[PDB]
C-alpha cells in the first residue's frame, strides 16, 4: 500500500542523494593529500573530507520533503547534531568488507587523532549496517530520518520535526512491507532504528575525542572553518 505521496518521497530522496554523493570521488583530488608514512598526519586530509561531506549532507537535507518548513534555527540544530552520524551512515556505501589513496583503514583514522574507543564500534557499525544489505531507497530514507530527529538538543518546534520524521518513517515501514521480500525484511525497520541508536553512541564518543583533539590550537589549526563551526570551537 505505497501511496503516491510515499513514492514521490522516495523518488525525491534518491535523486537528492545522487546529486550529493559522487562514488567516483572526483572531488577528493582537491583535498589536502593524505599522509601515510605519523602523528595526526591524516588529520588534514580527513578534516577536509569531513568538511566536504558536511557540505554534501547539507545539500541532501534541504531536499528532504518537509525540511524547508522548519525554521533556519531548527534546521541548524538538526544538521549540527546529525552531521557526523549521516556521514558515518553515507560512508557505508563505500565501506568494503574486502583509489587506494582514498581507501581508509583503522590506522588512517588513528592518524586523525582518534582511538579504538570510537574506531572499534565504528567498524562494528559499518559491518552490521552492511549486513542489512539495504535497498538504496531504504538507505536514503534512513539518512533523512536521522537528520529530522525530534529529540535533538536545542529543537524548538519538536512537534513539527516529529511530523516530518513520521511521514518519512511511515514511508520506510510501508516500503519494507511492499518492496523488501523476506527473509531480508525480517525486523528490518527495528534493526534500522537500532543503527540510529548506535549512531547516537558513536556521535557521543566522536564528540568527546574531537574535544580532546581540538583543544590543542595546533590541531584546531589543521581543521576547516566549517568543521569548526559545526563540530564546535
Amino acid at each position: 500500500k505505497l501511496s503516491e505521496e510515499q513514492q514521490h518521497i522516495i523518488a525525491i530522496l534518491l535523486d537528492a542523494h545522487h546529486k550529493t554523493y559522487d562514488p567516483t570521488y572526483a572531488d577528493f583530488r582537491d583535498f589536502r593529500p593524505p599522509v601515510r608514512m605519523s602523528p595526526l598526519s591524516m588529520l588534514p586530509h580527513l578534516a577536509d573530507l569531513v568538511s566536504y561531506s558536511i557540505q554534501k549532507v547539507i545539500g541532501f537535507a534541504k531536499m528532504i520533503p518537509g525540511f524547508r518548513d522548519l525554521t533556519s534555527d531548527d534546521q541548524i540544530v538538526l544538521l549540527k547534531s546529525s552531521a557526523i552520524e549521516v556521514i558515518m551512515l553515507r560512508s557505508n556505501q563505500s565501506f568494503t568488507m574486502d583509489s587506494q589513496d582514498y581507501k581508509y583503514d583503522v590506522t588512517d583514522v588513528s592518524k586523525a587523532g582518534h582511538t579504538l574507543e570510537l574506531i572499534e564500534p565504528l567498524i562494528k557499525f559499518q559491518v552490521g549496517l552492511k549486513k542489512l544489505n539495504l535497498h538504496e531507497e531504504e538507505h536514503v530514507l534512513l539518512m533523512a530520518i536521522c537528520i529530522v530527529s525530534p529529540d535533538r538538543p536545542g529543537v524548538q518546534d519538536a512537534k513539527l520535526v516529529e511530523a516530518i520524521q513520521d511521514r518519512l518513517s511511515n514511508t520506510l515501514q510501508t516500503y519494507i512491507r511492499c518492496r523488501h521480500p523476506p527473509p531480508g525484511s525480517h525486523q528490518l525497520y527495528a534493526k534500522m532504528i537500532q543503527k540510529l541508536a548506535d549512531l547516537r553512541s558513536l556521535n557521543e564518543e566522536h564528540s568527546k575525542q574531537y574535544r580532546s583533539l581540538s583543544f590543542q590550537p595546533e590541531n584546531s589549526m589543521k581543521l576547516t572553518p566549517l568543521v569548526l563551526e559545526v563540530f564546535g570551537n
Partner: peptide
C-alpha cells in the same frame, strides 16, 4: 553561538 556558514549553505 552563531553559524554564518551553516546558515548560508541552507540558503
Amino acid at each position: 553561538k552563531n553559524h554564518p556558514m551553516l546558515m548560508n549553505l541552507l540558503k
